[PDB]
Amino acid sequence: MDDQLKQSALDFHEFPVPGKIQVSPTKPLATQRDLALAYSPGVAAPCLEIEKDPLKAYKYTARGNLVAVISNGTAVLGLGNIGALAGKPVMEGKGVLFKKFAGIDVFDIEVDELDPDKFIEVVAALEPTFGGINLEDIKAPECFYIEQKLRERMNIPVFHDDQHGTAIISTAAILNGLRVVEKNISDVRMVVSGAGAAAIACMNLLVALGLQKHNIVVCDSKGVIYQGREPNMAETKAAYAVVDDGKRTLDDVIEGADIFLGCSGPKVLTQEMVKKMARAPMILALANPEPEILPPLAKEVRPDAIICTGRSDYPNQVNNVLCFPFIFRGALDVGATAINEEMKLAAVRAIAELAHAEQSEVVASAYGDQDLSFGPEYIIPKPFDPRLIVKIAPAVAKAAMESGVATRPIADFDVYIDKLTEFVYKTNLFMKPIFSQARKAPKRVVLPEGEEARVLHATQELVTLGLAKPILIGRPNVIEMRIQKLGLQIKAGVDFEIVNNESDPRFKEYWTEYFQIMKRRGVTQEQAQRALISNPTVIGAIMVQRGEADAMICGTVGDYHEHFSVVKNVFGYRDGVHTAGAMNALLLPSGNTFIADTYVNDEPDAEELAEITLMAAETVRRFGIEPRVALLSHSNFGSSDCPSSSKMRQALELVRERAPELMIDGEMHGDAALVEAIRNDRMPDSSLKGSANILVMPNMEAARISYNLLRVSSSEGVTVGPVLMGVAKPVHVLTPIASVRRIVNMVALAVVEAQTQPL
Amino acid sequence: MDDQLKQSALDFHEFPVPGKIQVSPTKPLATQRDLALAYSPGVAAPCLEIEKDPLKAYKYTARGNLVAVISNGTAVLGLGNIGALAGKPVMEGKGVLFKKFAGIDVFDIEVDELDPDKFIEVVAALEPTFGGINLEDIKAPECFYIEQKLRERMNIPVFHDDQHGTAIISTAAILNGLRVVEKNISDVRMVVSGAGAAAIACMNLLVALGLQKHNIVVCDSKGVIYQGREPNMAETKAAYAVVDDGKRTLDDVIEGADIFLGCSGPKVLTQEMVKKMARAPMILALANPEPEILPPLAKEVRPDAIICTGRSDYPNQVNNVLCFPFIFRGALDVGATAINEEMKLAAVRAIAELAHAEQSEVVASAYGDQDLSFGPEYIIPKPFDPRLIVKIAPAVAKAAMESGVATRPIADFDVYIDKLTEFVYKTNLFMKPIFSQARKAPKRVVLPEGEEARVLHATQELVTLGLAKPILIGRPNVIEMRIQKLGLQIKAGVDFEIVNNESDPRFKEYWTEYFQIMKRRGVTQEQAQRALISNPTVIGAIMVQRGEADAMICGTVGDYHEHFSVVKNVFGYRDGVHTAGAMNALLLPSGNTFIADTYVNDEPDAEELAEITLMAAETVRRFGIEPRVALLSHSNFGSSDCPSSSKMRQALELVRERAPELMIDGEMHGDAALVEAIRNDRMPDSSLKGSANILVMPNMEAARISYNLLRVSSSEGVTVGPVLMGVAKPVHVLTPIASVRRIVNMVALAVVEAQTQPL
């Protein structure tokens, strides 16, 4: 293990504060009332409820999201027995992983006890604190006895992940492989190396899944484990003892075998006995920190070999992080009393089915141009796939539903999946009304920049959600080749339409219409033809204008203002308005907030500010929020008389003249706008209540600087912008640094805008 | 208990997320390297260290800041035995209090066990997880046995706070009271009502403190507990069994007594037997939720009565929150193996001494115009006093030092107290170089606004820190009366000087000099006299100019620009400069950051921007930081050609011409300035490294809006501003909403600036 890596690990664990976890409150503790409610005499009130009903304990405490990771330091991942105090950082890291990947609060516990019975007594005593138990690093064979006793005795789910999770992943992998090579589960022959508990659980699951016991072979360091080899051998080991046939060595039984499993040590297998078994071997190496064999050797000696390792640098890694947080999430969200094998089967099926679907953006970006399509080189999902929780947790919850172990049944699964998604993507809670409205009637959207990888990913995700009917512009060859490269599943002509800009049958009409529009703006006919050949944005705008589409989303490459100029020239302002603006959404501690204007006007006057305010209010109303506007300046309610403050005052009077029912006030400082108490101290009778959610700035300088600084400082770094208002058709212009999720959000928003007859 | 209060408590405990705690990471977990370091194979590296040395476990894990709150639900605060699962919210609230008041991470644990021996076994088994144990809600007499066994058996400190903390507070209160009434500890006679463990610990401490056992009387519900009353009575109860004298009732022993203690129930004491004991009774009611008597009754029947209750609405509340977090902080920071009575004595002495000192701003604001000076009405500090940690924890640490139970001795106490203060005030870490430099040579500072409460509090805190020699301006009568009202301790003429603006012997020279300065600016002699009578800022500026002071801090009432105009007129620009600016400090996730210009120039040009940049760089250098400047705009490295961007480009070239060694670049977006990767993606060869810590805006609009929004959104809401640069003398102008701490910080900064010869 590298000395520099060791130094990096020590410095990471040390600075700037020792440890890796921290306990924080989730409530305000500022005033005296917070103290009164969070402690005596307030804290007594919920307590009585728990006395009347234990189930209500799942309703006022963290018990419904608390998991214990208990260890004794006897079976650390690669160090054997070193003491629990030595093993504490491992459990801290496990808890960090829990919180990161499933939003589950954990307590790590080291119990200095070696007697299994006293261990059981302690764990059973600690029951009311937690809602679930996960064991870790307990050596065999004590682990089986402890787990069985606790599962029988305790009333909450218990795992030993090293005994179960690896079994889940291996079962899913081998089932998928048998799907690949088209071999029936009945006639496959099983060969097992090592006596690690993962192997035993694997045979248990496979037998419960359909594998036949007469085709299995279990081999320890003593060779073939046949009946009568020794009388005082373990009963668990005896359960897989076969009728003796004279074979003693692993070489005798490996020939003609279908699947090889190993969790004992490196170099046990060799390329000759790799030649020994049947067609399409199933190499499965789980030994750490080195595998049984080198996958290059197995692949060079046999091409169709399938190899799975426990190391990240090799394809098809079996990492336990794929399972445990999600099974615990599913179990806890229904209050299952215990986790049976039904849940494990459901998890295996979920992993297998997820292995078939299309690749996500994160993993595709992370793992480069590797041939990551379904098949021998890609058989199980990567650890960082975000769809894992959404595909696993509802399945485990339904398995709990069927077996009757649930105690708090869920009504319908749709809101559950929605909540999980809001955990995953951090903007679903904000965008849910938009998605719900858009899904009722999809429209046609043009993405002129149809060769970018981000646009292709967004198109795939839009088709999957059934949220729009995309139209792409570009050369079909490049688009198809990149679709193959990224391993997507959308098919041209079935899920979306491709418009070949270099050669289209409607070129004549398009450039004729463009010239008819722009002849008085200094555009000759040759310029019109050249533009309709070379500029995708013009093609998209013309397509939208003629009614062959319904919305356009552009601007993910190049400058903002060229796209905006083209759009404004083609479409023009909507009736009753003489200006356009851009507005960015943001998530501050005080809630969602919109900022305008950030992109269009460099120095708006009072009239433009009034029109921008009205359009912003309408757009916010679309989100199902009650608009609350604030005009910002360095002047604080007339404390200065620079021209900007006067412009704000005139804009405010204009807005109050036009829309009398809108909640608006100003001009004020930012803190007064965002904080109720500060505003009430200086202006007790203001017409603005609560915290404002629309902020109007005097110039694009202030808007852009504030937006960027808040975007970075509000530690999320996510937005919904720039929404463009004032143009006569539902079009938006993005920025080159826009991510996939923002593109999807704007496509949904444009669809929603286009659903109604454009105003 | 009010139904509306019950509903409020339930809704507080329920929404928006169940529970009150949450476990969060303290390290980044974004990249693959974070995963590699926080888990396999990186996590193995520190583990081996723990195997080689257990003490190093205090160095890479949260064990050094982790406390367990263990309960069985048998002795809840006012509900007796209700079950541990019913009592869980109480421990959650206790842990929240721990984190809020001492920055200590806790695990709350409910053990469903009623056998004391099994309880002891479980707790002793859980030792390696934690660094300290605190018991809670365990009924007598099992609590004594469990605590004794665990203390003997376990190697980390253990408390039962209800048994010890109340004893600490009561001991401090009664010792202070005996100080008040001037009664010797030898001859005072003790009367005890109830058998609550707090009482027994109180007698133990008092006997260990100097109270004589022959003057004590212990009375249970059976009356006088004398020797031979019953043979099979408790040994702990037997330890205070007195030689029989024939007295049987509490009435017989209360007459002639000095101190009455009660923790049994309400209405036990009556006003006649209040008349029974000696002069100046010591009523001490700890029963909940109602006291033994109504304090109004005791005070009306006898004026000099001293009454202490356990309820917030009455004076001198005995709340356990005063002790336990701070004793645990002190014990943990030295690694004490156990907490003996030496630490408890040190804590009692610390509380007693703190009761004498001056009142803090927070408690004085919270508790109104009550006569909160030292005496019968104020005998123990309020729960929210921030000095509690600083006064307690070092004393407990030193007590650990003397008794040899410490395992990680501290070198010197000064850095310890500094670290505690940085925890308390959140800006000491930033301002420490300034305070250290200023404390070496204090100067003379004028605060013209010498009648505000905030200014008086700041003066008190400045005198205490020995950081300046303040001078106040105002009417002496009002100043003295308010000093009495707030209960401060600074004495006029000894700690500070008062300048009577209405009648001063130097009026003639002052107004003559003001006229000599301002005669050509339209100020007649009568106007000069009127100004020197009515305007404190002018008096302060003239005093500074003549050399009778060294710095001035003004502007906590009224508009900014009037004060700034007066200051600029009197002092003028420093040589080589033709402009002035203001700069605000702020604490973002990327570090400390300065923003300019926020208050002076409405629309600076290139030259003013260059001068402001240079002055800001020098001021930042004062803080011992290496300056890094960024010029912000909506244009991103020339993407636009509006006049503002051109002004930035000219300013940048000017700055590079003047100071060639300064690190500066621009103009850029905010995120590019703050984030390294974004800047490196667009401009790989920029001259700015890391994250900038000075931001220069094109106009006061953007600066003010960004500053306010970031101030609120960066969840601290604390600043150090506005620092004023460009004037020839060390003066600063604050804002009316400035708090005490900001005033202290600016006084220190002005002193530091004035220490060197002004440039």
| C-alpha distances out from residue A649 to A596, A604, A607, B205, Å | 17, 14, 11, 69
Question: Which residues of B participate in catalysis according to the annotation?
Answer: 39, 94
How far does A434 lie from chain B, in Å, by closest CA?
23
Residue pair B284/B260 in contact by the 8 Å Cβ criterion: yes
Backbone angles phi, psi at A116, to 5 degrees: -60, -35
d(CA B196, CA B198): 5
Contacts of B376 (CB under 8 A, 6+ apart): B180, B304, B306
Residue of A nearest to B58 (CA): A18
Residue pair B120/A85 in contact by the 8 Å Cβ criterion: no
- Whether B88 and chain A come into contact, CB under 8 Å, resolves to yes
d(CA B257, CA B283): 11
- Whether A653 and chain B come into contact, CB under 8 Å, resolves to no
Determine whether the interchain pair A14/B714 forms a contact, defined as Cβ–Cβ distance below 8 Å. Answer: no
- Whether B671 and chain A come into contact, CB under 8 Å, resolves to yes
Q: Which two tokens stand for residue A485?
A: 């490269």
Asked if the peptide bond before residue B504 counts as cis, ω within 30 degrees of 0, the response is no
Residue of B nearest to A737 (CA): B678
Residue pair A696/A609 in contact by the 8 Å Cβ criterion: yes
Interface test with A, best of B20, B22, B47 (most A CBs within 10 A): B47
- Whether B108 and chain A come into contact, CB under 8 Å, resolves to yes
Residue pair A171/A107 in contact by the 8 Å Cβ criterion: no
Residue pair A448/A537 in contact by the 8 Å Cβ criterion: yes
Residue B551 belongs to what H/E stretch?
strand B551-554
d(CA B41, CA A12): 13
d(CA B138, CA B652): 70
Determine whether the interchain pair B634/A10 forms a contact, defined as Cβ–Cβ distance below 8 Å. Answer: no
d(CA A392, CA A381): 12
In this structure, the dihedral spanned by the alpha carbons of residues A250, A256, A259 and A264, taken in order and rounded to 10 degrees, is: 10
Residue A299 CA neighbour count, 13 Å, CB half: 10
Say whether B577 sits in a helix, a strand or coil. Answer: coil
DSSP character string of A144-189? HHHHHHHHHH-SS-EEEHHHHHHHHHHHHHHHHHHHHHT--TTT--
Residue pair B702/A701 in contact by the 8 Å Cβ criterion: yes
The count of other CB atoms within 10 Å of the CB of residue B477 is 9
For residue B533, what are the β-bridge partners?
none
d(CA B195, CA B200): 7
Any idea what DSSP says for residue B757?
P
Backbone angles phi, psi at A45, to 5 degrees: -60, -50
Determine whether the interchain pair A9/B42 forms a contact, defined as Cβ–Cβ distance below 8 Å. Answer: yes
Residue pair A461/A748 in contact by the 8 Å Cβ criterion: no
What sign results for the dihedral spanned by CA atoms A496, A502, A504, A509?
positive
Residue of B nearest to A115 (CA): B125
Closest by Cα among B650, B658, B592 to B619: B592
Residue pair B539/B511 in contact by the 8 Å Cβ criterion: no
Contacts of A294 (CB under 8 A, 6+ apart): none
Residue bearing tokens 């959308």: A490
Pairs of CB atoms within 8 A across A/B: 401
What sign results for the dihedral spanned by CA atoms B736, B739, B740, B741?
negative
What sign results for the dihedral spanned by CA atoms B305, B309, B315, B316?
positive
| C-alpha distances out from residue A450 to A195, A418, A552, A562, B600, Å | 54, 30, 12, 18, 50
d(CA A233, CA B401): 58
Residue pair A588/A709 in contact by the 8 Å Cβ criterion: no
d(CA A53, CA A706): 50
Question: Resolution of the coordinates in A?
Answer: 2.9
Residue pair A346/A396 in contact by the 8 Å Cβ criterion: yes
d(CA B80, CA B72): 11
Kindly tell me the burial class for residue B31, based on how many C-beta atoms sit within 10 Å of its own C-beta (0-12, 13-18, 19 or more).
exposed
Determine whether the interchain pair B701/A698 forms a contact, defined as Cβ–Cβ distance below 8 Å. Answer: yes
How far does A466 lie from chain B, in Å, by closest CA?
31
Residue B96 CA neighbour count, 13 Å, CB half: 27
- Whether B118 and chain A come into contact, CB under 8 Å, resolves to yes
Say whether A501 sits in a helix, a strand or coil. Answer: coil
d(CA B643, CA B37): 49
Strand order in the sheet with B664-668: B664-668, B629-632, B694-696, B591-596, B581-588, B720-725
Any idea what DSSP says for residue B732?
E
Polymer length of chain A: 759
DSSP character string of B648-675? HHHHHHHHHHH-TTS-EEEEE-HHHHH-
> Which experimental technique did the depositors report for determining this structure?
cryo-EM
d(CA B396, CA B325): 12
Kindly tell me the burial class for residue B706, based on how many C-beta atoms sit within 10 Å of its own C-beta (0-12, 13-18, 19 or more).
buried
Q: Known catalytic residue: A39? A: yes
The count of other CB atoms within 10 Å of the CB of residue A658 is 12
- Whether B43 and chain A come into contact, CB under 8 Å, resolves to yes
d(CA A138, CA A6): 25
Please tell me which residue in A39, A491, A519, A689 is annotated as part of the active site. A39
Chain B 453-482, residues with CB within 8 Å of chain A CB atoms: none
Residue pair B307/B298 in contact by the 8 Å Cβ criterion: yes
For chain A, how big is the Rg over CA atoms in Å? Answer: 32
- Whether B18 and chain A come into contact, CB under 8 Å, resolves to yes
Three-state SS for B464-507 is HHCCCEEEEECCHHHHHHHHHHHCCCCCECCCEEEECCCCCCCH
Three-state SS for A3-66 is HHHHHHHHHHHHCCCCCCEEEEECCCCCCHHHHHHHCCCCCHHHHHHHHHCHHHHHHHCHHHHE
B320 among annotated binding-site residues: yes
Residue of B nearest to A736 (CA): B682
Farthest CA pair distance, chain A: 102
Residue pair B571/B731 in contact by the 8 Å Cβ criterion: yes
- Whether B1 and chain A come into contact, CB under 8 Å, resolves to yes
β-pairing, A581-588 vs A720-725, is antiparallel
Residues of chain B contacting A633 with CB distance shorter than 8 Å: 701, 704-705
Any idea what DSSP says for residue B186?
T
d(CA B408, CA A419): 48
Contacts of B178 (CB under 8 A, 6+ apart): B184, B185, B188
CB nearest to A43's CB, from B60, B93, B112: B93
Residues of chain A contacting B312 with CB distance shorter than 8 Å: 32, 36
Residue B477 CA neighbour count, 13 Å, CB half: 1
Determine whether the interchain pair B712/A670 forms a contact, defined as Cβ–Cβ distance below 8 Å. Answer: yes
How far does B556 lie from chain A, in Å, by closest CA?
15
Q: What per-residue string of b and e applies to B463-474 under the rule 16 or more CB within 10 Å gives b?
A: beeebbbbbbbb
d(CA B287, CA B291): 5
Amino acid at A566: V
CB nearest to B89's CB, from A25, A61, A634: A61
As a whole number of Å, the end-to-end CA separation of chain A is: 67
Q: Which two tokens stand for residue A477?
A: 């060859």
Any idea what DSSP says for residue A569?
H
For residue A498, what are the β-bridge partners?
A472
Residues of chain B contacting A17 with CB distance shorter than 8 Å: 26
What sign results for the dihedral spanned by CA atoms B423, B428, B433, B439?
negative
**Alpha-carbon B643 to chain mean position:** 48
Determine whether the interchain pair A107/B107 forms a contact, defined as Cβ–Cβ distance below 8 Å. Answer: yes
Strand order in the sheet with B190-193: B223-224, B216-220, B190-193, B259-262
Closest by Cα among B304, B308, B302 to B284: B308
Q: Which two tokens stand for residue B253?
A: 């022993």
Chain B 354-413, residues with CB within 8 Å of chain A CB atoms: 366
CB nearest to B289's CB, from A41, A86, A96: A41
Chain B 604-643, residues with CB within 8 Å of chain A CB atoms: 632-634, 639, 642
Residue pair A532/A539 in contact by the 8 Å Cβ criterion: yes
How far does B633 lie from chain A, in Å, by closest CA?
6
Residue pair A619/A603 in contact by the 8 Å Cβ criterion: no
Interface test with B, best of A33, A43, A107 (most B CBs within 10 A): A43
The count of other CB atoms within 10 Å of the CB of residue B407 is 13
For residue A631, what are the β-bridge partners?
A666, A696
Residues of chain B contacting A126 with CB distance shorter than 8 Å: 109-111, 122
Residues of chain A contacting B594 with CB distance shorter than 8 Å: none
d(CA A305, CA A298): 7
- Whether A671 and chain B come into contact, CB under 8 Å, resolves to yes
Chain B 535-594, residues with CB within 8 Å of chain A CB atoms: 559, 588-590
Chain A 151-170, residues with CB within 8 Å of chain B CB atoms: none
The count of other CB atoms within 10 Å of the CB of residue A554 is 23
Please tell me which residue in A58, A94, A378, A647 is annotated as part of the active site. A94
Say whether A339 sits in a helix, a strand or coil. Answer: coil
How far does A129 lie from chain B, in Å, by closest CA?
5
Residues of chain A contacting B641 with CB distance shorter than 8 Å: none
